[PDB]
């Protein structure tokens, strides 16, 4: 009888909720009450990268924190030198519908995917001075939402078919398949040690998965709508999620709870991208109101706004050394702030 | 110019890449874009065959005009998470089967999907081209089956005329943005041939009315 199983599952989730409640002795705000606030953060547009002709949907900084790859619906994947305004590369995609991009940590490969259900990996450091499609990973049923590199041979993707996957690049087969989500997975992030990863879906819940074993370690549910972004804290024991209800939430791995919520009454639109900064003191989040907000991670106050875009901000990133913050919006312009 | 030889060569390479990007964009800005939106295999494959994986693209030419048609009916995902990618499309094409009224009713689902697409917040200026089809088998069924099954509130003759017009008006009344949007209805069929000309005329009418709308007139 399925009713008995449903009742027993209800009992188990009630037990989990009670166990979580038992360990909540003090809130994050109470401990961080006595600390010096960061103050007012003023950032200036050092560079403006132009040349795209459509909506920019994703970007990813390089490991050297100097080169960056950007993807747009124009059908071009542009690799820029960020110190100057030069264009290192301009790759024409086979399918113009691209919604994600990635840059390999070694700096040799670049991956992109979208509505074609196929993740294309291009090799940049080749002979002949040309960029060609190294691999085309297929096997997904829904649109590809994100893709991240572990090394030069392994990749992790998530799709709208409520499924994530770990692929081996050399042989284009799904090495591991992660299932359990009841909604379209929209974002993922890798741990600094590349052993665990969290994924947010449209079922208003995030899940923490183990790469090697392939089973879901943990689940978290505190939101009210679709989750569009996720990112680990630099320490690696916490992460932050952004949803369509204009709220960011900081979950912690060890406490298995949510610690802090960032929201404000004047802001009501959704959130497209969330990323921390070096040392994890600041949290930058883009919004649908054409702006980007900086929150103090320890407290709940707001530090500043990065308002220099004329359309919805679709992606943003912070360098590995924290010197600059790049933002890309639905108008074809990339802006570097420092 | 406080630059080395290699930096100057890199600047030259970037300037050459800019020219190619601009030339590709200018060429890509001269094409007409159509988004095909059916409902439960309601004659979608019939019309794509008459014009000479998740998303399918069909490129063709007619009277010195390049048409690119996107079929996204095989996505089987949440529509609201990727529909905004199709903002700015020149026109939307809707296929409705007239023979499934006897066949949860399929016509009601088609009407609901048409209402959802037409009154969407992204396609507030794009025009919809209707392709009410399967007229022959519709007549064959209406000969021996009344239309009252779908529409209880209907008093009309049980013939092809006065019945297909009722369906056309019912589908057209679902529009709520008549101020900046128009619907072009056509009664095609499996053996019909002049569908491409109808699409061409609708597209050129849309182009003229958009050019005269940008300039401040109209």
């Amino acid at each position, epitope marked *: 009888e399925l009713d008995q199983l449903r009742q027993e599952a209800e009992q188990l989730k009630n037990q989990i909720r009670d166990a979580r409640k038992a360990c909540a002795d003090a809130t994050l705000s109470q401990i961080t009450n006595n600390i010096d606030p960061v103050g007012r953060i003023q950032m200036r547009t050092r560079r403006t990268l132009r040349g795209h002709l459509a909506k920019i949907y994703a970007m990813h900084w390089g490991t050297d924190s100097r080169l960056l790859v950007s993807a747009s619906q124009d059908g071009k994947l542009i690799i820029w*030198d960020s110190y100057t305004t030069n264009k290192v590369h301009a790759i024409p995609l086979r399918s113009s519908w691209v919604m994600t991009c990635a840059y390999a940590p070694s700096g040799n490969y670049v991956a992109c995917g979208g509505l074609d259900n196929i993740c294309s990996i291009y090799n940049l450091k080749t002979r002949e001075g040309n960029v060609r499609v190294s691999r085309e990973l297929a096997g997904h049923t829904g649109y590809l939402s994100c893709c991240r590199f572990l090394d030069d041979n392994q990749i992790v993707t998530s799709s709208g078919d409520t499924t994530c996957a770990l692929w081996d690049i050399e042989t284009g087969q799904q090495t591991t398949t992660f299932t359990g989500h009841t909604g379209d997975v929209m974002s993922l992030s890798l741990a600094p040690d590349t052993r665990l990863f969290v994924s947010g879906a449209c079922d208003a819940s995030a899940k923490l998965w183990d790469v090697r074993e392939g089973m879901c370690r943990q689940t978290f549910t505190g939101h009210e709508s679709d989750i569009n972004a996720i990112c680990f804290f630099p320490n690696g024991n916490a992460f932050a999620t952004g949803s369509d209800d204009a709220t960011c939430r900081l979950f912690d791995l060890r406490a298995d709870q949510e610690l802090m919520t960032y929201s404000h009454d004047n802001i009501i639109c959704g959130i497209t991208s969330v990323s921390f900064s070096k040392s994890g003191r600041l949290l930058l989040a883009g919004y649908d109101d054409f702006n980007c907000n900086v929150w103090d991670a320890l407290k709940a106050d707001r530090a500043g706004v990065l308002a220099g875009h004329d359309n919805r901000v679709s992606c943003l990133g912070v360098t590995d050394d924290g010197m600059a913050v790049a933002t890309g919006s639905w108008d074809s312009f990339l802006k570097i702030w420092n | 110019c406080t630059l080395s030889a290699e930096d100057k*060569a890199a600047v030259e390479r970037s300037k050459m890449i800019d020219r190619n990007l601009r030339e590709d964009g200018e060429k890509a800005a001269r094409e007409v874009k159509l988004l095909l939106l059916g409902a439960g295999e309601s004659g979608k494959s019939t019309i794509v065959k008459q014009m000479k994986t998740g998303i399918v693209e069909t490129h063709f030419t007619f009277k010195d005009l390049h048409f690119k048609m996107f079929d996204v009916g095989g996505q089987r995902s949440e529509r609201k998470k990727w529909i905004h990618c199709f903002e700015g499309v020149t026109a939307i094409i809707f296929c409705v089967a007239l023979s499934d009224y006897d066949l949860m009713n399929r016509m009601h689902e088609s009407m609901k999907l048409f209402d959802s697409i037409c009154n969407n917040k992204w396609f507030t200026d794009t025009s919809i081209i209707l392709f009410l089809n399967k007229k022959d088998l519709f007549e064959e069924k209406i000969k021996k089956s009344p239309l009252t099954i779908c529409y209880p509130e209907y008093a009309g003759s049980n013939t092809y005329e006065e019945a297909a017009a009722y369906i056309q008006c019912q589908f057209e009344d679902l529009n709520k943005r008549k101020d900046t949007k128009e619907i072009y209805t056509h009664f095609t069929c499996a053996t019909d041939t002049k569908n491409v000309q109808f699409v061409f005329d609708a597209v050129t009418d849309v182009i003229i009315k958009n050019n005269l709308k940008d300039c401040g007139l109209f």
Partner: single-chain antibody
Amino acid sequence: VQLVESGGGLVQPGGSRKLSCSASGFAFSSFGMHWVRQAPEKGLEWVAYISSGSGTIYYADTVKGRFTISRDDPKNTLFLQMTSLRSEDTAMYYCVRSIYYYGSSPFDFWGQGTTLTVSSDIVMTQATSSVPVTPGESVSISCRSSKSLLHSNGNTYLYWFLQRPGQSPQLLIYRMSNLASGVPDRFSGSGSGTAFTLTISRLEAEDVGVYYCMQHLEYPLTFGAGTKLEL
């Protein structure tokens, strides 16, 4: 990836000639090209350079005015037109490729060369001429400039080429302390702004040849005297 050169031969003084360089196996339309000549016994010497798209063309002062460079992209060919040949123009000519962007490796591939026989610049100096050494030891080669090769952006433009007896020059280290692809890690290079050194840890039987140090800070490009290695 291969380059084949045609032309050369015996030319009477005061005449004219044309040299062709055909590239097959790579994207010839996105690579800048160089013509470099070498005397029968002396060191290498730069001749001319043409950018991608023929936007910029640079000539050496020795043959400035009476030489012409050109390229054809659909046929993937490079042409050199030499006019009013003198007795000093006899040389082996090489057709080198070089692509310029961030992190690129200019002068990575060299042509085969064609022989021709006629009937205010930075001075790069290699004092050493020949070093006799046995295989298995570590060898250091010193190249001294006459100006600060270090630039305001932090890059040091110093290229090291190895030419084996009977073979075209091969790139080893393109910029200062930047090993090229396809060569063993046992080669290394360092410098101190004006004087630079090349170090080989475990010398083998394939390291016999001539080493050249070249500067790319500004045109005209200047080579150095040969530093032969003998067993």
